[PDB]
Design a protein around this nucleic acid. Structure first.
Ligand code: SF4
Lengths: 132, 87, 1080, 26, 171
DNA sequence: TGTTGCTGC
DNA sequence: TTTTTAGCAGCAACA
């Protein structure tokens, strides 16, 4: 079997838009790497409903239960990710030696689409600390 | 004389194994047990002895006792390993 | 035809490189088989026959013929031939006039007949020593040289070298310096194991065997254990380490073993490499083979030797772990395969938990095969990049095969090199030194005697940084000395350091005036507060250079007697160099009357016979061996001394003097000088080759990859001469070795201690020395100090000057030069010339960005041999002490150490640096003070986890009991080499830490099992809470981290007098008192 | 509700390269 | 700041492929007829390659032990306000990203061209006990693409032996 | 408070 | 059965 990579849309958008300035591309993308396993609940719809209204830590958006799992604050090259009430992660914005590329395999129509190309990543290599 | 025979002269491994299987069958027919005498006391070479000690009945000559004891020690370790393999 | 080695190409037979040599018995006559990877050929062996021999010494040279007739008639049952010969004996009076000891050479048909002659002669020597031509036999000499070593020395045949094998013997080629490429296999094995146990070859099976052959990868799998067929895959951890793996999915363990032995027979490897396979892999394969009725010796030629190490005839067994333990310079915490791969190959191999291996054979066998091929790739490239070029290079000079060259201790390698040189000079080898069973000093029994070794000082503690200011108090009189020495110190740098003439140097007065200005400004402004230059100054090969300079060997240390008997001992004699050393006794406080009282008491006691199949079960004291008598005496003297004198030992240091002969035959020192020059030669060649590897074109594959391997080669011969030299330096205190020289060793150390104290006493007057270790001084100098310069020759070449180095080297040459060195100019007339010898130079390393030195908890006491150092780029240059790099330990402290070391590069002042470091200390204290309620539970587990490995469980373990022992027993109650992963529990309160060690695997266990064991281990029947945070001893972990914070930071700043940056970790009470008494 | 965290891996590990089949993608 | 959210279900169609500089040049070329195409001989056995209009790379997946989350920016359908926790250094929220995928591997591309050694050497040494050189080179090309010195290829089983000018191959 | 053992630099 | 050396840190016991 065989199938083409469709990269026309990303290419046209790339040529018509300016060069990537910050860590986030103009199309709004970010990756993330954690030295560990992110321990999340096995269920979400049931648990998103018992979260009190003031916290909004488990919100509902367009019928999908999204968990608000943290906050990101970027200070130059330094970056900090707050997770939950008890986790703080310190990391850095590093320029990728090999620009990564995200694609998308449409199994339905047997079409492959180039989604985007990365140039930076936010890495956290130290043991998480409390948020203070 | 069969138990004390120098198996180190036999280059043919198959023939050495066959003789050792026949000797294990003979040791079983006479109910001769190989006992590790660990009365050495200093962790070096616990001599293997046959129980009952046929050696005390057969070996009349004191010169032959010393020659036979050195040859038997290497044979009895090989025979014990074969008895343990068969077990 | 006429034998000439110049016409070698007409010479007949076959040329080959000797890859492997072994002693054999030929139709028996003794011989050595030599295995030649050979040029061109795949291989071929050839045999040299040679008579084993030794010597008899006579006490009266006028009656040697009466001894000859006696030994012909007494040894008739075993002697082949006899000959009277002459050798130089350096213990003979006046041998320096060509007087040679007359000796009876006894030759034998084989090594067994030589051993019977030794059994017949030893009783005569024992009768002569304790109580006729029999009394003319003084001793037997050279009777203990290994037979293959004898043939290798006496024929000058060396592995790593190329030879032409001819009827007359072996002729060394000279045109071929590069090694042949042997077929190299490297393998590793994966075994089943029980949970929390080591594998046992009696019950456990081999699951897989991973291997590489010349860069191709292979995996054999046992399909009784491995659940799926593994397909061919690539494990290339870097582009410079390819690994394509072809897979053999075999039905069972016996098909796996047969495939492994078949593939060894097909490729005919002349090297097999493993990691620790002497003690795991080959023992396992051999025991599994025996269970299946296969004889591994008849299959592939491999058997266990007398040491239990695995060897063959044709193929050398290169256990990489032997080189890792001896030669890699890695500390024992970095000697496991992963940490060697990280530190040498510079990647992370795959890592699997040993408890997951046997489950993953069924659940995830692809990920188990990826792990197994990773350890084969790591072992193969570790062998080829490091072990191969190092060992075969050593074989080109040492009369040993690769297996012995890898496995013998470095002092035995020195013994072989000295035996080659003594043989080539026709010197008679000494018999091996036997330590006296007891010695006395002032009527006291010596427990042990030695000398004062290397000098070590910890002078300051703190953070020192190239961007933080330091106070300096320069002695103006040291600058006046340096200004007066400056003309001759600069001349010395041109003439001695750079081996040039001052007349060729165009800018000599320019450099002199630039240094003079900086020195005058430092004399006038002698109290400054400016930036430091952080320097290391270290003596190039210190002990070897002290030895060559002073002509120190064990062939010269002469008594007043031997010096008085020497015909060169006249009025005006210059050849008797007197040198000092510091002897150190440790003796029992008990006197000779008390010793004799203890001996008489032991004569009334009865002792067990160390006899086995023997009978007499009981001995008297006088029926014991003299060594056993003294062991029993020392035991009762330790009890008596403690009871009567309230101490077991006294130690005393006595300054002694010894006479170093300068006229004595030069063979030891010539080996050292010559070896030093050959190493320098290769450093030079290395540099020329470095220029060749860059001058040329960039087409990497254009027949210049031969040039780069030879670069590795000369580097390797460089490192080889290096180890050999630093070893000679040690060998000489090798108890039991020959050419031993306990003295000589004391002179070498005291001379070194005097040199480094002289250097420190200058550096302390012009800057601040921080740490001193044997040959090195760490210091800070003012940034205004005269530093690096370049002399310009008329030919436009630049010579290098480091003024801090050359000012020390000039003073070393004015104080420690040997103006008494004598060398033999005319060997026919015994004419000696006298010259001035000195080879003792400091080198300089730096400047460095930062240095961190820890302080003691004791008042006024530094911590020696512990520091961290950083390069200008912020990379970690050098470290001392510390943990993390260790196997196991507490993960919290490893993660804390990983974070903290890089942060010492932050901040513009020493206080600013300690404040950045204190931020990280406080963050790691918050995690503990908050009971780590944060993060994830499993993560808390890992960090808190402490891991410890048990060597051999079994009875060593029925034996002692402690925390790991408690963890291993708790794993045994619940579920060699076992990894005891544990935490410390708060309960039972007031119980020892060894009884509070809980295995972490209980936290992942079923709630009923977890509850029952936690109740039983905490001694709390009411324990209903099973959270890991309420079980943990947070106080214990807080003390462990607080003790790391004290050692690495609080001390440095507080020891240097800067306020304590981590107040949440208080100083020890001695240090608080020391600060208060410093501020008063 | 406050039961979200990272179980920290002590060291970064990168696994073995693997071949890719058509089924690996889909 | 940007609030990071996660969906209960990720799309596994999104995968990460390493893009070398050359791949980037290829990617930014609108001129090409065919830009890139995944190709395989069959579905279950053969390797998968990535092809441009004139070059071919073989794909190799490389698993890692980390959790890698890709976040895309999203505009929340209804205004959502979050409570402030004891979090320090927080600017006003201006956009929102959601981790939509969790990838465990990358796709490396290695350039590639779009039988028992010992036995073959045995048969080569047979027909002719002693062989030439330029004669034996095209005969051994087939055994190891490792790119080696031809002599090493021969020494995998047969062995060289020299004389005055000729070097023959025997055993 | 000091010495002594052991491991390991 | 074969085998380089001394100086030092620091935990833990006991004189
Ligand atoms: S000092 Fe001179 S006379 Fe004395 S032993 Fe040495 S060489 Fe002979």
């Amino acid at each position: 079997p065989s199938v083409d990579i469709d990269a026309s849309q990303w290419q046209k958008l790339t040529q018509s838009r300016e060069k990537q300035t910050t860590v986030i591309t103009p199309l709004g993308m970010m990756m993330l790497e954690i030295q560990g396993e992110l321990e999340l609940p096995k269920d979400f719809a049931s648990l998103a409903r018992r979260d009190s209204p003031n916290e909004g830590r488990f919100s509902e958006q367009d019928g999908e239960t999204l968990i608000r799992f943290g906050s990101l604050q970027i200070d130059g090259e330094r970056a900090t990710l707050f997770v939950g009430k008890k986790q703080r992660l310190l990391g850095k914005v590093t320029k990728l030696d090999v620009p990564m590329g995200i694609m998308h395999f449409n199994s339905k129509d047997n079409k492959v689409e180039l989604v985007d190309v990365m140039k930076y990543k936010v890495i956290f290599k130290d043991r998480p600390l409390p948020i203070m | 004389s069969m138990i004390s025979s120098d198996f180190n002269k036999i280059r043919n491994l198959k023939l050495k194994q066959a003789i050792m299987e026949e000797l294990v069958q003979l040791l079983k027919s006479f109910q001769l047990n190989l006992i590790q005498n660990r009365s050495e006391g200093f962790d070096v070479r616990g001599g293997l002895t046959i129980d009952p000690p046929i050696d005390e009945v057969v070996l009349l000559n004191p010169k032959h006792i010393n020659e036979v004891q050195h040859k038997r020690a290497n044979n009895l370790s090989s025979l014990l390993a074969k008895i343990e393999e068969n077990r | 035809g006429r034998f000439d080695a110049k016409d070698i190409d007409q010479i007949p037979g076959r040329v080959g490189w000797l890859t492997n040599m072994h002693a054999t018995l030929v139709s028996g006559i003794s011989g050595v088989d030599f295995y030649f990877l050979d040029e061109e050929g795949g291989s071929f062996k050839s045999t040299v026959v040679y008579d084993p021999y030794f010597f008899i010494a006579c006490n009266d040279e006028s009656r040697v013929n009466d001894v000859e007739e006696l030994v012909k008639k007494y040894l008739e049952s075993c002697l082949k031939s006899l000959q009277i010969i002459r050798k130089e004996d350096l213990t003979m009076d006046n041998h320096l006039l060509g007087l040679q000891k007359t000796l009876i050479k006894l030759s034998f048909v084989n090594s067994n007949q030589l051993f019977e002659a030794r059994k017949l002669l030893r009783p005569i020597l024992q009768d002569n020593a304790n109580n006729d031509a029999k009394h003319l036999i003084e001793d037997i000499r050279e009777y203990d040289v290994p037979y293959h070593v004898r043939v290798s020395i006496d024929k000058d045949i060396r592995v790593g070298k190329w030879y032409k094998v001819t009827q007359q013997g072996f002729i060394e080629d000279t045109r071929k310096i590069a090694f042949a490429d042997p077929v190299v296999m490297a393998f590793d094995i994966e075994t089943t194991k029980p949970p929390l146990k080591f594998p046992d070859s009696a019950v456990d099976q081999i699951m897989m065997i991973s291997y590489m052959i010349d860069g191709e990868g292979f995996l054999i799998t046992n399909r009784e254990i491995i659940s799926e067929d593994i397909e061919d895959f690539e494990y290339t951890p870097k582009p410079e380490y390819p690994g394509f793996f072809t897979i053999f999915n075999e039905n069972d363990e016996v098909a796996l073993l047969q495939r492994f032995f078949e593939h060894i027979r097909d490729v005919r490897p002349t090297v097999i490499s493993t990691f620790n396979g002497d003690f795991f892999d080959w023992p396992f394969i051999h025991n599994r083979s025996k269970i299946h009725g296969l004889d591994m010796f008849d299959e592939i030629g491999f058997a266990p030797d007398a040491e239990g190490e695995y060897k063959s005839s044709y193929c050398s067994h290169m256990d990489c772990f032997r080189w890792v333990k001896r030669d890699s310079y890695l500390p024992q915490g970095s000697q496991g395969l992963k940490a060697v791969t990280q530190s040498k190959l510079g990647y992370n191999p795959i890592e699997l938990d040993p408890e997951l291996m046997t489950p993953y054979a069924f659940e995830k066998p692809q990920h188990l095969s990826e792990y197994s091929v990773s350890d084969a790739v790591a072992t193969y490239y570790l062998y080829m990049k490091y072990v191969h070029p190092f060992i075969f290079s050593l074989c080109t000079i040492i009369p040993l095969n690769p297996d012995e060259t890898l496995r013998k201790g470095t002092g035995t390698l020195c013994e072989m090199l000295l035996m080659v040189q003594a043989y080539q000079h026709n010197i008679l080898l000494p018999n091996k030194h036997t330590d006296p069973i007891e010695r006395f000093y002032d009527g006291h029994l010596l427990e042990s005697e030695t000398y004062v070794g290397g000098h070590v000082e910890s002078l300051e503690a703190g953070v020192f940084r190239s961007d933080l200011k330091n106070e300096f108090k320069i002695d103006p009189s040291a600058i006046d000395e340096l200004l007066q020495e400056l003309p001759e110190a600069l001349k010395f740098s041109v003439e001695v350091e750079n081996k040039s003439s001052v007349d060729k140097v165009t800018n000599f007065e320019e450099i002199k005036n630039q240094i003079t200005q900086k020195l005058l400004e430092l004399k006038e402004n002698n109290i400054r507060n400016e930036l430091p230059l952080i320097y290391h100054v270290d003596v190039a090969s210190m002990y070897p250079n002290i030895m060559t300079t002073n002509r120190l060997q064990p062939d010269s240390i002469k008594a007043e007697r031997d010096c008085a008997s020497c015909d060169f001992n006249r009025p005006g004699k210059t050849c008797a160099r007197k040198l000092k050393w510091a002897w150190r006794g440790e003796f029992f406080p008990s006197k000779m009357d008390e010793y004799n009282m203890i001996k008489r008491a032991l004569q009334n006691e009865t002792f067990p016979n160390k006899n086995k199949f023997s009978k007499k079960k009981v001995l008297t004291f006088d029926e014991l061996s003299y060594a056993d008598q003294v062991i029993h005496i020392k035991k009762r003297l330790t009890e008596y001394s403690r009871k009567v004198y309230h101490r077991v030992k006294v130690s005393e240091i006595v300054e002694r003097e010894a006479i170093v002969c300068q006229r004595e035959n030069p063979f030891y020192v010539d080996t050292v000088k010559s070896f030093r020059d050959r190493r320098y030669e290769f450093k030079g060649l290395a540099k020329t080759w470095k220029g060749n590897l860059s001058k040329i074109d960039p087409s990497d594959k254009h027949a210049r990859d031969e040039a780069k391997k030879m670069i590795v080669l000369y580097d390797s011969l460089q490192l080889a001469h290096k180890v050999i030299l630093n070893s000679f330096y040690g060998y000489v205190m090798r108890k039991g070795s020959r050419w031993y020289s306990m003295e000589m060793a004391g002179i070498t150390c005291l001379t070194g201690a005097t040199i480094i104290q002289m250097a420190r006493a200058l550096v302390e007057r012009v800057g601040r020395p921080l740490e001193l270790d044997t040959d090195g001084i760490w210091c800070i100098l003012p940034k205004s100090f005269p530093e690096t310069y370049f002399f310009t020759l008329e030919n436009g070449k630049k010579l290098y000057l480091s003024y801090p180095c050359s000012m020390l080297n000039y003073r070393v040459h004015q104080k420690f030069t040997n103006h008494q060195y004598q060398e033999l100019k005319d060997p026919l007339n015994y004419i000696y010339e006298t010259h001035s010898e000195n080879t003792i130079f400091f080198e300089v390393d730096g400047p460095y960005k930062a240095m961190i030195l820890p302080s003691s908890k004791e008042e006024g006491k530094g911590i020696k041999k512990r520091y961290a150092v950083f390069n200008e780029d912020g990379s970690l240059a050098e470290l001392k002490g510390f943990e993390l790099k260790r196997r196991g330990e507490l993960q919290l402290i490893k993660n804390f150490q990983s974070d903290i070391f890089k942060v010492f590069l932050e901040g513009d002042t020493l206080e600013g640096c300690y404040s950045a470091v204190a931020s990280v200390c406080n963050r790691w204290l918050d995690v503990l003070d908050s009971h780590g309620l944060m993060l994830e539970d499993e993560d808390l587990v890992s960090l808190i986890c402490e891991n410890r490995s048990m060597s051999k469980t079994l009875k060593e373990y029925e034996g002692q009991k402690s925390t790991s022992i408690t963890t291993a027993r708790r794993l045994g109650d619940f579920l060699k080499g076992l990894q005891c992963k544990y935490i410390i529990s708060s309960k039972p309160f007031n119980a020892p830490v060894t009884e509070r060690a809980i295995p972490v695997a209980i936290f992942s266990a079923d709630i009923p099992i977890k509850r029952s064991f936690l109740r039983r281990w905490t001694l709390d029947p009411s324990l209903e809470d099973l959270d890991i945070r309420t079980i943990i001893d947070w106080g214990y972990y807080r003390e462990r981290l607080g003790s790391a914070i004290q050692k690495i930071i609080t001390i440095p700043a507080a020891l240097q007098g800067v306020s304590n940056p981590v107040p949440r970790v208080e100083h020890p009470d001695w240090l608080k008192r020391k600060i208060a008494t410093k501020e008063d | 509700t406050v039961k979200i965290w990272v179980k920290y891996n002590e060291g970064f590990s990168n696994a073995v390269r693997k071949n890719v089949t058509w089924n690996n993608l889909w | 700041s940007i609030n990071l959210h996660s969906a209960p279900e990720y799309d596994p169609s999104y995968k990460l492929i390493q893009l070398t500089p050359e791949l980037l040049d290829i990617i930014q070329d609108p001129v090409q007829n065919h830009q890139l195409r995944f190709k395989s001989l069959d579905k279950d056995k053969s390797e998968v390659v990535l092809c441009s209009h004139d070059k071919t790379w073989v794909l190799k997946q490389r698993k890692h032990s980390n959790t890698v989350l890709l976040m895309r920016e999203f505009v929340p359908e209804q205004p959502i306000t979050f409570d402030e926790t004891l979090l320090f250094g927080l600017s006003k929220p201006y956009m929102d990203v959601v981790g939509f995928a969790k990838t465990e591997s990358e796709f490396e591309t290695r350039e590639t061209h779009g039988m028992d050694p010992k036995e073959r050497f045995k048969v080569l040494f047979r027909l002719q006990s002693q062989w030439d050189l330029e004669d034996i080179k095209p005969l051994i090309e087939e055994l190891n693409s490792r790119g080696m010195k031809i002599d090493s290829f021969i020494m995998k089983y047969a062995r060289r032996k020299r004389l005055g000018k000729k070097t023959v191959v025997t055993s």
